């Protein structure tokens, strides 16, 4: 009957490679540690993250599927000098810190986001990451309408996100912040459920560390998150870095699959988790701390419309385009906050050389390119097959494409 014995691969190829521990057999290798203050020391080297960075970048969701993260013991990055250094340097020194990462599919838009998150944990910042925004726009989660907060709330995703924040961010950095207002929530904790129906918070005596810990009801979880974000906005002690990946989904999907009570489709801005995420990029949510920083990243698994080109000024404005392919409200929200782009440059021959060197050291290549090939010929051929420096195509050439 139940033919699926425990420990048997039953999902698709991608899911199996992503979940099943295919890295249990990987070869350990001593590599440098990713640190920005030592970037001059590891400018062009395939460096591995630290244990702090690895514990983070996991709750945040910085490492995704279909990245070949399982060919090695743990995810690794090349640092580079025209993408990582050129990005983090302006992130440190730019008067207004809000950027969007662009480029061709497979360039490394995510990996650069993960590097930014690693820099944040190194630099003692509170990180909020939304990663795949399709989860709260597809319709596979619960929702309700909040009368006071005149918006739609999604308690399941809200619970997951608050748990992400709490489990990733440093307890010391979170406890360092003291509450500014007093919040009264309902109680959903099985312990002390009957004795008290509402939990209470107090000014300058409780903290955000237990603000996140409080467990409330689905209908009040929206106000819970409002409190989280407003307190983090008014704090000015430690920086807050807010990040959304696959921002193409949101700027191309204005209307969610979530359907109103009259056949209407609820607007993303009318739905919370879109209003919160868009007001911060636009500038309605002001962070007191000087170096809060905001980062966005588009994905190649998403259709393209004129919205982002018009927002970034790459093409003029055509007012006759249909809403399915141009959204003036999204453009206006993006332009009110002075977001500037950042196109990730593709690899060079030298970057391909170092990557292939590391791959050989880790034994992820073949006899084809280890026995009968000369290094110059191999690097030239792979640079040519990778579309002149596309990391995903380079990996696919080296490992996946076997003939």
């Amino acid at each position: 009957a139940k033919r699926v014995t425990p420990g048997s691969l039953y999902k698709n190829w991608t899911n199996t490679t992503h979940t099943a521990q295919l890295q249990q057999t990987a070869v350990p290798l001593a590599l440098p540690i990713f640190n920005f203050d030592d970037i001059s020391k590891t400018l062009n080297k395939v460096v591995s993250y630290s244990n702090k960075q690895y514990k983070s970048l996991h709750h945040l969701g910085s490492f995704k599927k279909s990245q070949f993260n399982e060919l090695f013991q743990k995810p690794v990055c090349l640092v580079r000098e025209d993408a990582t250094n050129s990005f983090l340097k302006k992130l440190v020194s730019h008067p207004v810190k809000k950027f969007i990462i662009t480029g061709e599919p497979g360039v490394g838009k995510t990996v650069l986001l993960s590097q930014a998150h690693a820099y944040a944990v190194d630099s003692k910042q509170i990180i909020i990451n939304i990663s795949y925004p399709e989860l709260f726009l597809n319709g596979r989660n619960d929702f309700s309408y909040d009368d006071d907060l005149k918006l739609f709330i999604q308690p399941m995703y809200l619970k997951k996100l608050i748990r992400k924040i709490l489990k990733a961010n440093d307890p010391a950095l979170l406890k360092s912040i003291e509450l500014s207002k007093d919040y009264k929530f309902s109680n959903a904790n099985p312990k002390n459920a009957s004795v008290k129906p509402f939990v209470t918070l107090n000014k300058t005596k409780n903290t955000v560390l237990d603000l996140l810990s409080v467990m409330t009801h689905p209908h009040n979880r929206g106000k819970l998150m409002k409190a989280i974000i407003d307190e983090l906005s008014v704090q000015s002690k430690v920086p807050i870095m807010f990040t959304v990946d696959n921002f193409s989904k949101v700027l191309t999907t204005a209307y969610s699959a979530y359907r109103n009570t009259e056949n209407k489709q609820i607007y993303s801005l009318d739905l919370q988790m879109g209003k919160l995420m868009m007001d911060i990029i636009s500038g309605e949510t002001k962070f007191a701390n000087g170096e809060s920083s905001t980062i966005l990243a588009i994905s190649g698994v998403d259709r393209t419309n004129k919205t982002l080109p018009v927002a970034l000024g790459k093409i003029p404005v055509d007012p006759y385009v249909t809403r399915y392919h141009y959204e003036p409200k999204f453009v206006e929200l993006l332009q009110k906050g002075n977001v500037t782009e950042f196109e990730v440059p593709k690899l060079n021959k030298q970057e391909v050389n170092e990557l292939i060197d590391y791959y050989k050291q880790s034994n992820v290549l073949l006899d084809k390119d280890i026995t009968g090939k000369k290094w110059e010929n191999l690097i030239d051929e792979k640079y040519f097959l990778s579309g002149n420096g596309n990391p995903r195509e380079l990996l696919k050439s080296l490992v996946l494409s076997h003939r």
Partner: protein
């Protein structure tokens, strides 16, 4: 032998089977053996044409 596995994806099933054969747990070695034994039995009928 790979189609007798569970995974809904042929790539996964085939990879599992190839891994099994690489570690020498194939279920067709006995088929090779039966064919080879039959050839050993019929050696006599061989007639160089």
């Amino acid at each position: 032998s790979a189609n007798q596995r569970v995974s809904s994806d042929f790539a996964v099933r085939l990879g599992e089977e190839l891994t099994a054969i690489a570690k020498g747990t194939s279920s067709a070695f006995e088929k090779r053996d039966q064919i080879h034994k039959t050839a050993i039995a019929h050696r006599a009928y061989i007639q160089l044409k």
